[PDB]
A paper describes a structure:
The heterodinuclear Mn/Fe cofactor is found in the R2 subunits of subclass Ic ribonucleotide reductases (denoted as R2c) as well as a related group of proteins known as R2-like ligand-binding oxidases (R2lox). The two metal ions are bound next to each other in octahedral geometry by two histidines and four glutamates, with the manganese ion occupying the N-terminal metal-binding site 1.
In the wild-type, the hydroxyl group of Y162 is hydrogen-bonded to the carbonyl oxygen of V72 prior to cross-link formation, and this hydrogen bond is maintained in V72A/L-R2lox in the oxidized state. In the oxidized state, it appears that the bridging fatty acid ligand is slightly tilted towards residue 72 in V72A- and away from it in V72L-R2lox, although these slight differences are within the range of the coordinate error. More mass spectrometry samples were consequently prepared in the dark. The Y162-I72 cross-linked peptide was obtained by digestion of aerobically Mn/Fe-reconstituted V72I-R2lox, but only if the samples were processed in the dark, whereas the cross-link was not present in V72L-R2lox.
Author numbering:
A (entry chain B): 3 to 250, 263 to 286
B (entry chain A): 2 to 286
Write the structure that this text describes.
Amino acid sequence: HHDGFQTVKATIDWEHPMFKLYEKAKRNGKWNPADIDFSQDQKDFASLTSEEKISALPLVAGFSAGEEALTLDILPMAHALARQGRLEDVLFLTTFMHDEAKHVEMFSRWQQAVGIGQMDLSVFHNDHYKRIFYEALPEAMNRLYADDSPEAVIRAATVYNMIVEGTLAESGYYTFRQIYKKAGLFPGLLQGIDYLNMDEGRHIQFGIYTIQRIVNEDERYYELFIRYMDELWPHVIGYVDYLTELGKIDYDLLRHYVIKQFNLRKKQISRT
Amino acid sequence: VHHDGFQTVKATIDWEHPMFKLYEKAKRNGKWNPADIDFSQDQKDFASLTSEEKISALPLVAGFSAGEEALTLDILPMAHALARQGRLEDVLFLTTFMHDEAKHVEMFSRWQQAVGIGQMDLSVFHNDHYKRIFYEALPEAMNRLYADDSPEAVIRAATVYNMIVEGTLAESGYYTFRQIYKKAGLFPGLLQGIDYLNMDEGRHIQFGIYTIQRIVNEDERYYELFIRYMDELWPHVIGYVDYLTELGKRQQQLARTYALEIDYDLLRHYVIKQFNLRKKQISRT
Ligand SMILES: CCCCCCCCCCCCCCCC(=O)O
Ligand SMILES: CCCCCCCCCCCCCCCC(=O)O
Ligand SMILES: [Fe+3]
Ligand SMILES: [Fe+3]
Ligand SMILES: [Mn+2]
Ligand SMILES: [Mn+2]
Ligand SMILES: [Mn+3]
Ligand SMILES: [Mn+3]
């Protein structure tokens, strides 16, 4: 049952950080994947040899599954914060969920346009990738339906926002730019990446806000965060190594960048 | 719970799915931002009103504000249950649905803040019938879906949420706002909001129609479940409407001041009409 309603007893908390982030999401989130012109991507793709075509698909396969998992798996976070009465968080999360839906749409439109919609790209998900996206991520978010304790929320935000978004996604945007932007290939896709990268800045800020406000309550939670981060690193790097190994471009630069993101996300949370 | 795979890796979005097409319309038609609405004239209007006229408008606003908030929170179980069923295109659309309702919450709250009543507790205008619908039956029907996503459960959730709350009460609220405040020329920023809300609502009701019908299409038995759940909530729909009416009939000074003949019998009949029209938008097959 509802005991009452915040915007009937009072108003929105206009100064709340997540209301501010919601306002910025509406302002900066107007893009529409249906407006991206993929015609040249299609031509670029067909101009590749079979072997070059294949080299492109692992990274797209990681992203398409990623965007789909994140669209589905943010719902428990929204439910748990809703149940906690965190109205402004929920408003923001409506823009978060809608962003990920557009991200799903973007990669699928690209697949459709370049002619691989009918191909099953699951073959490029190795065991490490499945451990994160098929298993650890949904386990950690679905937990929130029955256990919204500080520890559960931090673990959910660590896997979703600091690992998948803050570490793999950010590294994937950089990777696309280092490989295809220099080659002049897939300009529609890279336009998409630009929009996704901009959305991701807000998504990561929500993860930081969430984790830090729980840490501020008890610095014992800081240790949990670092522990959950380190528990996932071997699959992050197991996946990265798998991708790198297929690519054989400075692949060792890209691998540094993953490490640099991982440590950056740890340093964005304050012990105190 | 594991993911077994992902549609957009094995295949693509179903580009021709009705809910993907509704999703596309939502993105095209749903750009409006409540932060862009100018309420400065509304603030002047409200302050020019006497105390009796000031409170004349508030029962309706109280009903909407809680409605918007309830609907923002309570659509999340429907999105979960369709996501668990693998209905990706429905989920895409529901992201636009939930964002619309968030903007609806924001719109009414901005208006309350702007006119100077954000600090007033408007729960006093929720009678017993309203609470039966919005504080109880609605969250019960939606929350059920976390442990019972059966056709019977999904039909009941869509009925309460899309056909009763949206299709009957919200639609009749939009109409009432226009018959009264648009006629009198008051609260232009609010009415701009109401028109955006009304446009959004069309999609929300169409999702409800799609959902109920696709279930009825699998077994006609469910059509009579739909009708019975509609009739079960009617006494609360009309009990709330009568409450608003009785309030409206005893606070006549706004109508007098602004030269309006508020036909409350006409408004009642619009609500009855909406209830029966929503019933008729569902067929046995
Ligand atoms: C080859 C160098 C390794 C670079 C790392 C690339 C990882 C690919 C990204 C796949 C997961 C993307 C998750 C989506 C996040 C979101 O939608 O917010
Ligand atoms: C005086 C005549 C009464 C007419 C009926 C008035 C009904 C008031 C509406 C309040 C409930 C609105 C629910 C919001 C629904 C939504 O956000 O989709
Ligand atoms: Fe994201
Ligand atoms: Fe609605
Ligand atoms: Mn390994
Ligand atoms: Mn009664
Ligand atoms: Mn994304
Ligand atoms: Mn609404």
